[PDB]
Write a protein that binds this ligand. Structure first.
Ligand SMILES: Nc1ncnc2c1ncn2[C@@H]1O[C@H](COP(=O)(O)OP(=O)(O)OP(=O)(O)O)[C@@H](O)[C@H]1O
Ligand SMILES: N[C@@H](CCC(=O)O)C(=O)O
Ligand SMILES: [Mg+2]
Lengths: 13, 17, 15, 274
C-alpha cells in the first residue's frame, strides 16, 4: 500500500 | 492505448486488486 | 482530504 | 462601410477567449470555422495576416496534466502552485502552431511562425526587415501567424504586452488596409453588455464615445480587456488604418464585414465627414 501511495501515475503504468 | 485509458479512469482503490 | 483522494480517479484529480 | 470594396490586405486577430473554450481546450468549433473562412478569403485574393493569441492557456492546461501524471500521491495533497510565468507560454505556442498547421494542411494554405518581441521592435532597421519579409511571404500566397514571444522576453512602450496592440503596430507598419479584432462580444458596447442600459454602437466618434465607456466596472488588467482593445483600435485608426471590432464566436461574420453588411463597430479616421 505505502508503495502504491508513494507511486507516480506514470509508475502505476 | 486501452491500458492507458483504463489506468486513467481507474480509482486508486482499484489499483490494489 | 484523504478518503476522497483515495477513492477518486487520476482523471478526477484533474477536475 | 464603403472602404470594403478596396481592401486587399487585412490583419485579423483571434483573442485567447476566442481560441480557448473550456479547460485549456482549443475551441475546435470556433478555430475551425475561423480558419476555414480565412482560407476561403485567402483564395479570393486577400492578403491575410493572422495575429493569434492563446498559447498561455494551452501551455497552462498541458503543463497541469504534465504535473499530475508526473506527481506522487503525496503531492496531490496540497493544491500545486503557479506553473510558470513564461514556460506555460512556450509550450502553448508550440501547441497552437501545431494545431494551426494540422488544420491548414487540409485546405492547403501554408503558414509561418513569425514571433516578435518588444525589444526586437523599436530596434532601428528592424521595423523594416520585418516589413519586407512579411511582404514577400504574403506575395507567395502564404498566411503569416504573428504572435508575441512570451518565453524569451524579459518584461515579465511600443507593443503593449498584448497581441491586440501588436496587431495595431504591425498593421500600421505592414501598411495594411483593415485590422479586425474578433472578440467574444458583438462589438464595443456602452459598458457591460449584460444590463439593457448599455447599447451597441456602430461608429466610434472621437469626442462622443469617451464619456460612457467604463470598459466594465471590472478592470480586466490581465489582457487589458476592453480598455486596451479600444486604445489599440483608436491608435490604428489614427495612423491611417480603418479598424472594425466584431464577434469571433461566429466566423461567418468576417465575410459580412469584408463584404460590407453594417456589422460590428467602426473606428474610422473619417468621423467628421460621415
Ligand atoms: N465596455 C465593454 N463593452 C463590452 N464588453 C466589455 C466591456 N468591458 C469589458 N468587457 C468584457 O470583457 C472582455 C474583454 O475581452 P478581452 O479583450 O480581454 O479578450 P481578448 O481579446 O481575448 O484578450 P487577449 O487576447 O489579450 O487575451 C470582453 O469579453 C467583454 O465581455
Ligand atoms: N502569450 C500568448 C498571448 C498573450 C496575449 O494575450 O497577448 C501567446 O504568445 O500566444
Ligand atoms: Mg485583453
Amino acid at each position: 500500500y505505502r508503495q502504491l501511495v508513494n507511486s507516480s501515475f506514470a509508475d502505476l503504468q
